[PDB]
Amino acid sequence: VTTATLKRQLLQGILQIDDTAADVPVTYGEMVLQGTNLVTALVMGKAV
Amino acid sequence: RGMDDVANARVPADLVI
């Protein structure tokens, strides 16, 4: 991560570009407590 | 105990009242 000035100074002749497009995930991956996890977080105070 | 929370024989012996 850098400034545009340093990016240009690096891309002109120092570094070489490999690719211009890439693949990226689109999911957040939520999580919630249910089942035996809710009952153990009220009578004991812990969860896994 | 439990962990399910969803929310005879004739024997001789004297008995008095």
What Å resolution does this PDB entry report? 3.7
Q: How far, in Å, CA of B3 to CA of A39, rounded?
A: 9
Are the beta carbons of A47 and A40 closer than 8 angstroms? yes
User: In 3-state terms, what secondary structure has residue B5?
Assistant: coil
- DSSP secondary structure letter of residue B6: -
Q: What method was applied to determine this entry?
A: cryo-EM
Amino acid symbol at A11: L
